[PDB]
């Protein structure tokens, strides 16, 4: 890494310098390092210059903005100091040449949208490693290659792409957030595909000019969103996707439809055609959105040339991200969702999930966390006494707080609380629900997902909803 390679095409006369590193952050800023000085939140790295230079930072690019003019090179205590106007829309572009262009040495798929973009990106980074990519995944669990996922700014960003290319990542999916896009984060990135999920003429207006400085490469569009349509409209070569008749298919571009999906015990069965032909999928997954974020993610595949029939033989493989809407099924025994869900709406949308799924009666367990926000509590009990036919109360996280108190503010929310059944221990209600629910019934545990905790008092109690199904039904969590 160099100092005059790094700018050669904006700076032609920089000086030749080896760097290490390239932070934002004066106090990290170490022997070699470049610093780059950028003005954002009332906060100006030009102020840093000095602890930069004293810490033996290699050299310095700076925001030119009332300072100096676009490529000027200044000279502090030996230490060269470059100026470019607009450095927050040019870091990317900085950042990836540093890294070696990271995202031209890998299939990096970004995926927009208010919901769905985890699971979207998950199962991009699964499929594509069933055909025999070694996968990743940038968002909001984390970052890493598949299974090895670790808990930001435009460098960060090519930064971490540039690590995953060094681990052998050959494919990406990166969850894109509207704040990113707007902040110049992935400015640079070169797409090989942008998936989107789901006063508007502003709005609109601002996105509009965002994504046409962008390489958004294959554009997939959700055709069963509003906004979607509007957008496909407007993208002749768009793919779009749709599970509710959306495809509009006089435009004669690329598609893919959901004709029939059967929601059942364990899953659903999606029956779909595409400009690609035609297939049935067996989909591990439950509810409604999860449909969409799968044929998503296959309109996607398709559309960056990888072959149905290899997608085909491979959909049956795709897994749930753990503790979401993650489906145990045992032969003759109550179908069992773990679900994360720990706010009303997200109850809500889950037991909509559920309920496709249930022949029978949904059961609803779930409960609270103790010494957090109490105004929760009884609207997640009339989404539980509404969206279910059961609703088991019980503990979840009661802390310090006295366990049976958050019971009865959940159940003052409901009508008719009586009706709710009240079982402590969560262990014992989880039990009391799998062991009374008949075969065709769902029961939905929400709160925990994938958290193997339950705190009682100041203790991190081993226990998790996952493990106490699985053994319950005779199966491994």
């Given at each position: 890494r160099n100092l005059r390679d790094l700018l050669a095409p904006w700076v032609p006369d920089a000086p030749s310098r080896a760097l290490?590193?390239?932070?934002?952050?004066?106090?990290?800023?170490?022997?070699?390092?470049?610093?780059?000085?950028?003005?954002?939140?009332?906060?100006?790295?030009?102020?840093?210059?000095?602890?930069?230079?004293?810490?033996?930072?290699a050299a310095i690019i700076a925001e030119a903005k009332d300072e100096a003019t676009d490529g000027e090179i200044?000279?502090?205590?030996?230490?060269?100091?470059?100026?470019?106007?607009?450095?927050?829309?040019?870091?990317?572009?900085?950042?990836?040449?540093?890294?070696?262009?990271?995202?031209?040495?890998?299939?990096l798929v970004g995926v927009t949208g208010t919901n769905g973009k985890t699971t979207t990106t998950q199962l991009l980074a699964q499929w594509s490693q069933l055909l025999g990519e070694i996968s990743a995944v940038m968002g909001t669990v984390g970052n890493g290659l598949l299974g090895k996922v670790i808990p930001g700014s435009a460098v960060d960003v090519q930064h971490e792409l540039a690590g995953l290319v060094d681990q052998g990542a050959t494919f990406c999916a990166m969850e894109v957030s509207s704040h990113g896009l707007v902040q110049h984060r992935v400015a640079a990135l070169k797409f090989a595909a942008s998936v989107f999920t789901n006063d508007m003429e502003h709005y609109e207006a601002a996105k509009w000019l965002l994504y046409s400085e962008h390489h958004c490469g294959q554009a997939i569009i959700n055709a069963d969103d509003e906004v979607?349509?509007?957008?496909?409209?407007?993208?002749?070569?768009?793919?779009?996707?749709?599970?509710?008749?959306?495809?509009?298919?006089?435009?004669?571009?690329?598609?893919?439809?959901?004709?029939?999906?059967?929601?059942?015990?364990?899953?659903?069965?999606?029956?779909?055609?595409?400009?690609?032909?035609?297939?049935?999928?067996?989909?591990?997954?439950?509810?409604?959105?999860?449909?969409?974020?799968?044929?998503?993610?296959?309109?996607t595949l398709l559309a960056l040339g990888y072959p149905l029939a290899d997608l085909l033989k491979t959909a049956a493989r795709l897994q749930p991200v753990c503790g979401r809407m993650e489906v145990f099924t045992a032969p003759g025994k109550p179908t069992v969702v773990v679900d994360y869900a720990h706010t009303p709406d997200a109850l809500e949308k889950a037991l909509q999930a559920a309920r496709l799924h249930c022949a029978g009666k949904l059961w609803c367990v779930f409960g609270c966390g103790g010494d957090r926000d109490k105004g929760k509590r009884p609207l997640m009990g009339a989404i539980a006494e509404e969206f279910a036919d059961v609703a088991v109360v019980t503990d979840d996280n009661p802390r310090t707080e006295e366990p049976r108190a958050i019971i009865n503010d959940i159940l003052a929310g409901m009508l008719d609380a009586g009706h709710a059944k009240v079982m402590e221990g969560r262990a014992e209600a989880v039990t009391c629900a799998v062991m009374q629910a008949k075969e065709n019934d769902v029961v939905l545990v929400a709160?925990?997902?994938?958290?193997?905790?339950?705190?009682?008092?100041?203790?991190?109690l081993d226990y998790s909803d996952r493990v106490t199904v699985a053994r319950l039904l005779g199966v491994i969590a």
């Open positions: 290490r590193e390239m932070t934002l952050d004066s106090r990290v800023a170490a022997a070699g390092d470049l610093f780059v000085a950028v003005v954002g939140h009332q906060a100006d790295g030009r102020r840093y210059i000095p602890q930069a230079i004293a810490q033996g930072v200044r000279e502090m205590h030996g230490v060269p100091v470059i100026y470019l106007s607009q450095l927050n829309e040019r870091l990317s572009a900085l950042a990836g040449r540093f890294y070696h262009e990271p995202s031209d040495n890998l299939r979607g349509r509007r957008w496909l409209a407007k993208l002749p070569d768009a793919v779009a996707v749709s599970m509710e008749d959306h495809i509009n298919p006089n435009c004669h571009g690329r598609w893919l439809k959901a004709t029939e999906v059967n929601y059942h015990d364990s899953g659903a069965t999606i029956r779909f055609s595409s400009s690609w032909g035609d297939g049935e999928i067996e989909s591990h997954l439950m509810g409604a959105f999860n449909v969409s974020n799968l044929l998503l993610a296959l309109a709160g925990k997902g994938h958290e193997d905790y339950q705190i009682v008092g100041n203790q991190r």
